[PDB]
CSV table of N, CA, C and O in Angstrom, one decimal:
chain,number,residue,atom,x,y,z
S,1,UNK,N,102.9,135.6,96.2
S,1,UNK,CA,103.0,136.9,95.6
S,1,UNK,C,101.7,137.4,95.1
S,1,UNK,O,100.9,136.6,94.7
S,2,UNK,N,101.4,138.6,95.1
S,2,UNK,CA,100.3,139.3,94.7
S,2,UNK,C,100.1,139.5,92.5
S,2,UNK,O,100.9,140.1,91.8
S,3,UNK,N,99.3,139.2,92.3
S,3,UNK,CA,99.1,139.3,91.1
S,3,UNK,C,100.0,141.4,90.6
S,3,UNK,O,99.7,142.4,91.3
S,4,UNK,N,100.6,141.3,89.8
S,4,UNK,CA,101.4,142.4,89.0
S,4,UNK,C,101.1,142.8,87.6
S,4,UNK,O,101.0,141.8,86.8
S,5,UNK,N,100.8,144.1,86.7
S,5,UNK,CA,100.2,143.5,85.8
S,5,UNK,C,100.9,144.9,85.2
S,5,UNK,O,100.1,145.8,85.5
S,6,UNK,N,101.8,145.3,84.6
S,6,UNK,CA,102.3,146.4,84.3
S,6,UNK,C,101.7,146.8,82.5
S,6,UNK,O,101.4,145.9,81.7
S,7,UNK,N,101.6,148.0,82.5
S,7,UNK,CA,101.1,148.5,81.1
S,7,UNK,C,101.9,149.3,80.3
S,7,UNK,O,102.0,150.5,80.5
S,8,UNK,N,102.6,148.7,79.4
S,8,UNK,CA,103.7,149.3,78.7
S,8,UNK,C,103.3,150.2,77.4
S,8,UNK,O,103.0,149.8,76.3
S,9,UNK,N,103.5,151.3,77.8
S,9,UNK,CA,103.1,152.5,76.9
S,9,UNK,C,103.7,152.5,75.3
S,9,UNK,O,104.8,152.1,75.1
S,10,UNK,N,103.0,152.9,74.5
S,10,UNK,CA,103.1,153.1,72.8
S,10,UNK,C,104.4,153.9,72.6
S,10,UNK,O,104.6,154.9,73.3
S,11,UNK,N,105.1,153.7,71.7
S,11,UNK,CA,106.5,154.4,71.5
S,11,UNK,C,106.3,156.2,71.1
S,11,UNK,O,107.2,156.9,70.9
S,12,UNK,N,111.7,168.8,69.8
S,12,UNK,CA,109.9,169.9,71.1
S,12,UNK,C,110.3,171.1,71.0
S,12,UNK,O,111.5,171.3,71.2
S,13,UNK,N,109.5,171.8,70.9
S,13,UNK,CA,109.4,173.4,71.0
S,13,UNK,C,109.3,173.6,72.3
S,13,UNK,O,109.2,174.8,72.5
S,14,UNK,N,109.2,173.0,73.5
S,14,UNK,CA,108.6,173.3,74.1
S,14,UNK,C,110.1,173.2,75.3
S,14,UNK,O,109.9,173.7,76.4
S,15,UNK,N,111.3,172.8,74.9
S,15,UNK,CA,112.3,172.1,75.4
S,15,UNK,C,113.2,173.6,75.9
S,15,UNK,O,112.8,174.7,75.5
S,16,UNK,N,114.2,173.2,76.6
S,16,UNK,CA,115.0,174.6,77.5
S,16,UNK,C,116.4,173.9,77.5
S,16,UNK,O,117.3,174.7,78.0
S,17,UNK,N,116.9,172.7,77.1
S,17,UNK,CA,117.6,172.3,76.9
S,17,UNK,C,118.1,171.1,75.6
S,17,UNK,O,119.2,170.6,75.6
B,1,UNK,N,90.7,152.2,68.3
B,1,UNK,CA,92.1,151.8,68.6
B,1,UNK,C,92.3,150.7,69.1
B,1,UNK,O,91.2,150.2,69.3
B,2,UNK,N,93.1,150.1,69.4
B,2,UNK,CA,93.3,148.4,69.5
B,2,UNK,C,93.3,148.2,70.9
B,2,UNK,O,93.3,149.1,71.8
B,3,UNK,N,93.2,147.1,71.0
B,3,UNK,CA,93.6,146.4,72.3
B,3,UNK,C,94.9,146.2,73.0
B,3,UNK,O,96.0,146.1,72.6
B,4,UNK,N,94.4,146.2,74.1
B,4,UNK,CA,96.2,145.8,75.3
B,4,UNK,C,95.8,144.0,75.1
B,4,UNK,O,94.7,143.5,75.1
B,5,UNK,N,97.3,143.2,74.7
B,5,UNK,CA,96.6,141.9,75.4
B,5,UNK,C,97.9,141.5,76.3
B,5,UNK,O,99.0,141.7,76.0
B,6,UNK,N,97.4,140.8,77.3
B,6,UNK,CA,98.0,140.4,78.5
B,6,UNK,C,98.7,139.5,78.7
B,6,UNK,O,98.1,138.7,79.4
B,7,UNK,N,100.2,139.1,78.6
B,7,UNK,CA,101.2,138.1,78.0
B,7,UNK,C,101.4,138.1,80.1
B,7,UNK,O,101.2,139.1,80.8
B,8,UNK,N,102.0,136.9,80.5
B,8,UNK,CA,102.5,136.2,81.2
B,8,UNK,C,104.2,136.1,81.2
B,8,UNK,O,104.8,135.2,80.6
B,9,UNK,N,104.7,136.7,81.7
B,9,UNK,CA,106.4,136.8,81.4
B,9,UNK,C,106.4,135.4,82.7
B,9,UNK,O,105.4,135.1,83.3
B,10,UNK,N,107.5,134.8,83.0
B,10,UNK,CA,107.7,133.3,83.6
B,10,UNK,C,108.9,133.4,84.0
B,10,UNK,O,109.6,133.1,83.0
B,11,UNK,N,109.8,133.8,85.4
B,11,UNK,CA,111.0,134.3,85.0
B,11,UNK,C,111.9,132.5,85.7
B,11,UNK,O,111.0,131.6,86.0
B,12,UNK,N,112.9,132.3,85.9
B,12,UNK,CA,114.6,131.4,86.4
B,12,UNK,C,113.5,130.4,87.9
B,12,UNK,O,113.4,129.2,88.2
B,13,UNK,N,112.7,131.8,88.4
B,13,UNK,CA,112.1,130.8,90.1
B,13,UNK,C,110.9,130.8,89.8
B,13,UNK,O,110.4,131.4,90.8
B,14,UNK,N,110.1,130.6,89.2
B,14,UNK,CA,108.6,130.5,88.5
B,14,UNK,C,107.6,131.7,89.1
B,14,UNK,O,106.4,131.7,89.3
B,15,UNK,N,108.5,132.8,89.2
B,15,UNK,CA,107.3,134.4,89.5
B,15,UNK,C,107.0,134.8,88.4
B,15,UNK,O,108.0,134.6,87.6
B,16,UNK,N,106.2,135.3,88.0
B,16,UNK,CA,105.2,136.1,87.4
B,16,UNK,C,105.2,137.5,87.5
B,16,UNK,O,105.3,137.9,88.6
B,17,UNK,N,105.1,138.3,86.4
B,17,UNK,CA,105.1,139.7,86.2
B,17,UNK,C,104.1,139.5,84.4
B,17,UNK,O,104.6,138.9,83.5
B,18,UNK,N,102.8,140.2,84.4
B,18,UNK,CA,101.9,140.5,83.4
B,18,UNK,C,102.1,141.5,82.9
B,18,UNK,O,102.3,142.4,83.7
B,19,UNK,N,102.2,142.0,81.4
B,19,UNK,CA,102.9,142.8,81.0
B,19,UNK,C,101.3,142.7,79.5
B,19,UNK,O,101.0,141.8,78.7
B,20,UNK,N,100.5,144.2,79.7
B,20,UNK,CA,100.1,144.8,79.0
B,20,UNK,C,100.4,145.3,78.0
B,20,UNK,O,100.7,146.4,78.0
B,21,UNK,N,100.3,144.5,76.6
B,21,UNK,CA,100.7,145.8,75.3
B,21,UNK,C,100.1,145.3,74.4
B,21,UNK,O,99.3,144.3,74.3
B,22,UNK,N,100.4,146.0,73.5
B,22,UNK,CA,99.2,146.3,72.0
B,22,UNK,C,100.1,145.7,71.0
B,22,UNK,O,101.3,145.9,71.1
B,23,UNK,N,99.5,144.9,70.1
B,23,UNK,CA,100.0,144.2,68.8
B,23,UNK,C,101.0,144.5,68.0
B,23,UNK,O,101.7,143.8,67.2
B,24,UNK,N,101.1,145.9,68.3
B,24,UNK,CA,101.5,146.7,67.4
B,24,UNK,C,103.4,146.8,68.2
B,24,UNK,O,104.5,147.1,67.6
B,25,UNK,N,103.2,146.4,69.6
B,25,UNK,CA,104.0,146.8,70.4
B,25,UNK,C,105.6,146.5,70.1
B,25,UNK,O,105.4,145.3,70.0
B,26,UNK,N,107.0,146.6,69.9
B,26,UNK,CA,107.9,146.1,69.9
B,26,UNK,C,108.5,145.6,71.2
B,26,UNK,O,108.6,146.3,72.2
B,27,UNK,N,108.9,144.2,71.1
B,27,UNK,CA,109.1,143.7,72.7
B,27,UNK,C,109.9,144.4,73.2
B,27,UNK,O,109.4,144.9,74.2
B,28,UNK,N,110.9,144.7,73.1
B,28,UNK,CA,112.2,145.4,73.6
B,28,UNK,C,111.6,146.7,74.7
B,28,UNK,O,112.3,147.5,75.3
B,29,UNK,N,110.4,146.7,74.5
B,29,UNK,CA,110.0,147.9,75.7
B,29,UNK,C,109.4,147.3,77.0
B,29,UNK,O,109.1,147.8,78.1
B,30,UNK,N,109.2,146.1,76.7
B,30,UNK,CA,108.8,144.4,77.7
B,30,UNK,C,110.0,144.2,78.1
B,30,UNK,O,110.3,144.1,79.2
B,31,UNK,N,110.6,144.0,77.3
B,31,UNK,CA,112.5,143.2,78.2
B,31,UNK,C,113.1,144.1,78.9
B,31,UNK,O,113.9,143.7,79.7
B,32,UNK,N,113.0,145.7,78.7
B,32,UNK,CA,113.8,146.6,79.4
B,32,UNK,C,112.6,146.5,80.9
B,32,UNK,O,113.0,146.3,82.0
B,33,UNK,N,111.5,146.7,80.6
B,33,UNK,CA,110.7,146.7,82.1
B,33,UNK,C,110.8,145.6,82.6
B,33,UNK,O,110.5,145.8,83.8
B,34,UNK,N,111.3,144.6,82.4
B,34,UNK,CA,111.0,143.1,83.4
B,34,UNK,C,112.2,143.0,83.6
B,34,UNK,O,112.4,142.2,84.6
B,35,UNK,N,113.9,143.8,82.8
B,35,UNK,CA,115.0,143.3,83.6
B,35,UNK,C,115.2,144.2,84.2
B,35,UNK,O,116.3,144.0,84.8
B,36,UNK,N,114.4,146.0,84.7
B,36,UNK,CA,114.1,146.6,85.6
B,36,UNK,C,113.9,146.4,86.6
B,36,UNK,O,114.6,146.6,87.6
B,37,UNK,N,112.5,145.7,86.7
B,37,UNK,CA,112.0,144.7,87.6
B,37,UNK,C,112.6,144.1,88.5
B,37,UNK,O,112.2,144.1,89.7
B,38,UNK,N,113.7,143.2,88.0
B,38,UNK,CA,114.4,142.3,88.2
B,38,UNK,C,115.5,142.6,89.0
B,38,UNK,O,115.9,142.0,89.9
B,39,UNK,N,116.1,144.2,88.2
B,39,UNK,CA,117.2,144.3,89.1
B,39,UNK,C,118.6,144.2,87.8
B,39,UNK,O,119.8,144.5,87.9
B,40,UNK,N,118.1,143.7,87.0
B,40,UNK,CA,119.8,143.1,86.3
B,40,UNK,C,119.5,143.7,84.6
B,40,UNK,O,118.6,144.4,84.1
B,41,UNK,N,120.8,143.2,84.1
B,41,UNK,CA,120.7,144.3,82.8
B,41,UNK,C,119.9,143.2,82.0
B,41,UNK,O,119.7,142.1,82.4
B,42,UNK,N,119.5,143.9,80.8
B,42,UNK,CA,118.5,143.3,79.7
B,42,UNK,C,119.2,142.6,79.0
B,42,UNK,O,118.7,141.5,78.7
B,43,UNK,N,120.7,143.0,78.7
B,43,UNK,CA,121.4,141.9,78.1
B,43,UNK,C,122.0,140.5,78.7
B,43,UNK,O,122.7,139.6,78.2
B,44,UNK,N,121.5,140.6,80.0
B,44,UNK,CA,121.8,139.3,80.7
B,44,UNK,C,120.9,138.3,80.9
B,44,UNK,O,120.9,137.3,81.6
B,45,UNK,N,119.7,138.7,79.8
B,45,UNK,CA,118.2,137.2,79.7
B,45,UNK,C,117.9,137.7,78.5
B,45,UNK,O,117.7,138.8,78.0
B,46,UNK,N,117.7,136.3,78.0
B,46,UNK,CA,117.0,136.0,76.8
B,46,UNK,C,115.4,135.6,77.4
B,46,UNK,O,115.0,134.9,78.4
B,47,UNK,N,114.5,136.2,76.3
B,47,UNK,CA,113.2,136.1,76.6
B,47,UNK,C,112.5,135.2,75.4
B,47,UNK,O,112.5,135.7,74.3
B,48,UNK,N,111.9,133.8,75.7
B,48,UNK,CA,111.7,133.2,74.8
B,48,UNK,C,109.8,132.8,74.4
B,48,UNK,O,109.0,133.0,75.3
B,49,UNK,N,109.3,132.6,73.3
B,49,UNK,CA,108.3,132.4,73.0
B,49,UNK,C,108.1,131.4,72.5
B,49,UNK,O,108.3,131.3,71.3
B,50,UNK,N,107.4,130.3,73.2
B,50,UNK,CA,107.7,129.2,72.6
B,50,UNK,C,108.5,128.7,72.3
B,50,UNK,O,108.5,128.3,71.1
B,51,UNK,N,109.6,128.6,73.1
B,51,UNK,CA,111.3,128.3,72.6
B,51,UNK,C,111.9,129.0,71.7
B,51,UNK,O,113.1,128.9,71.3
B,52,UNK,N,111.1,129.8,71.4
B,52,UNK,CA,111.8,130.6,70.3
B,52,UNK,C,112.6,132.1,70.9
B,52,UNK,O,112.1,132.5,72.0
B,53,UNK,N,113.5,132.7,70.5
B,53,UNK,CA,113.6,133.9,70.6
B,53,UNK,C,113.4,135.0,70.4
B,53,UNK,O,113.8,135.5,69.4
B,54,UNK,N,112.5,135.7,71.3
B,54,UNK,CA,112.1,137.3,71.0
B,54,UNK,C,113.0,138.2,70.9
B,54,UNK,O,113.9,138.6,71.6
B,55,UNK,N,112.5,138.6,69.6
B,55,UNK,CA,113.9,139.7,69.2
B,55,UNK,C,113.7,140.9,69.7
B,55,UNK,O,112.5,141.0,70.0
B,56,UNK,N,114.4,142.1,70.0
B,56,UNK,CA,113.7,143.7,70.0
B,56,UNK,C,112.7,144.3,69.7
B,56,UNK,O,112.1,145.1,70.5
B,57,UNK,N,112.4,143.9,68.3
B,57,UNK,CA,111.5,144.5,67.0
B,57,UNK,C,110.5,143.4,66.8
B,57,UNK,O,109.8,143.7,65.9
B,58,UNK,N,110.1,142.3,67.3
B,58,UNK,CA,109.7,141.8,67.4
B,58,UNK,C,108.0,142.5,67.8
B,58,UNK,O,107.8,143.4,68.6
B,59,UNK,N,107.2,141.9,67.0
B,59,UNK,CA,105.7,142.5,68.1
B,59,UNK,C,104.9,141.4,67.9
B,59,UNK,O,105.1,140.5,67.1
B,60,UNK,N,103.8,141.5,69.0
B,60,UNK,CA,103.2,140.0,69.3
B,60,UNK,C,102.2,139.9,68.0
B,60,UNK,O,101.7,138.8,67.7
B,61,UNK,N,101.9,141.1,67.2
B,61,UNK,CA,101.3,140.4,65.8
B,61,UNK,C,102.1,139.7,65.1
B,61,UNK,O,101.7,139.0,64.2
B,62,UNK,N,103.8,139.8,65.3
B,62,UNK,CA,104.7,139.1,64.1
B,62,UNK,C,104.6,137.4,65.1
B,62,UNK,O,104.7,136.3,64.6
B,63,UNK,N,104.5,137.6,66.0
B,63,UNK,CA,104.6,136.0,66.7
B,63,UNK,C,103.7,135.5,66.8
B,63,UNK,O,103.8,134.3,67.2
B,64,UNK,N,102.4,136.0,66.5
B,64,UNK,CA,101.4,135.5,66.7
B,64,UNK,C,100.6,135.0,68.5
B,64,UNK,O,100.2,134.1,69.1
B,65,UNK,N,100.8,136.2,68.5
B,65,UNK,CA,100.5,136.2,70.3
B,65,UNK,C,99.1,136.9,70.5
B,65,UNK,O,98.6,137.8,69.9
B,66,UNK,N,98.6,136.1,71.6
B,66,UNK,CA,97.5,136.0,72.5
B,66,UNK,C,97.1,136.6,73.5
B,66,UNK,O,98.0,137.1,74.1
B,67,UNK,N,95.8,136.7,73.9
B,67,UNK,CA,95.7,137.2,75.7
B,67,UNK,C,95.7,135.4,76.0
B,67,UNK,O,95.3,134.4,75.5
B,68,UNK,N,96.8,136.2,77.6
B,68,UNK,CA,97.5,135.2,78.5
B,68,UNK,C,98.2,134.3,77.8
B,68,UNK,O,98.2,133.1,78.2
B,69,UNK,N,98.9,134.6,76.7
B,69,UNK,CA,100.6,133.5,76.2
B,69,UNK,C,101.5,134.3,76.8
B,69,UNK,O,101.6,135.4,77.2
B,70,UNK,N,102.6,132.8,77.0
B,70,UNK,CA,103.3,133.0,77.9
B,70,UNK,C,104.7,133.4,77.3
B,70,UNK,O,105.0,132.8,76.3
B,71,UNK,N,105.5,134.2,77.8
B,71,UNK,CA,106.9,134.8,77.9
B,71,UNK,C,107.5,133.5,79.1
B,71,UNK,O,106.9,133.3,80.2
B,72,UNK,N,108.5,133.0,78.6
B,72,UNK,CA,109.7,132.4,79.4
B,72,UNK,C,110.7,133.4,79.5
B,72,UNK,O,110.6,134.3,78.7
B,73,UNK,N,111.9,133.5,80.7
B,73,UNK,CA,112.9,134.4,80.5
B,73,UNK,C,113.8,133.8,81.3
B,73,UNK,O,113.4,133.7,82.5
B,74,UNK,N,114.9,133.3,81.0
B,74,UNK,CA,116.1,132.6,80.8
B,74,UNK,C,117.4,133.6,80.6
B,74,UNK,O,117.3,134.7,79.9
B,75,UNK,N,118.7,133.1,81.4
B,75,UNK,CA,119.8,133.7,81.3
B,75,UNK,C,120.5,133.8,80.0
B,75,UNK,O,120.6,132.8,79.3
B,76,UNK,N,120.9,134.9,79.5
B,76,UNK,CA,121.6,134.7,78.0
B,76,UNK,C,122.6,133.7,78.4
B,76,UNK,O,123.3,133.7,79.4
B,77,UNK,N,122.5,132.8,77.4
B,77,UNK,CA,123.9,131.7,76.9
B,77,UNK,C,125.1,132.2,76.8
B,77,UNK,O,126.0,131.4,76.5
């Protein structure tokens, strides 16, 4: 298998719904 | 701002998936990506740390985690 290395991101007026 | 550090998840057939996050991070956003991964729901593996169990809320500053410590991940009991 090829090395995998995922980056798990940090945890609205602008919204139409 | 802090660092990513680089944990080793270890899954049932000894493959590997590296999972990037910050100290600060709560695991539960690690167990939903690797039982994505996987294919199967999140509540069907337990993810352990040193034999211990990672909880949700858990973050690798409360476990005391490293660049390259390893995540085991095992079927829930």
């Amino acid at each position: 298998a090829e090395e995998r290395v995922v980056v798990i991101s940090s945890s609205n007026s602008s919204s139409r719904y | 701002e802090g660092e990513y550090i680089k944990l080793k998840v270890i899954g049932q057939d000894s493959s590997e998936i590296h999972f990037k996050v910050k100290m600060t991070t709560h695991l539960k956003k690690l167990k939903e990506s690797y039982a994505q991964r996987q294919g199967v729901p999140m509540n069907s593996l337990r993810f352990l740390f040193e034999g211990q169990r990672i909880a949700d809320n858990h973050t690798p500053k409360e476990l005391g985690m490293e660049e390259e410590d390893v995540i085991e991940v095992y079927q829930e009991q």
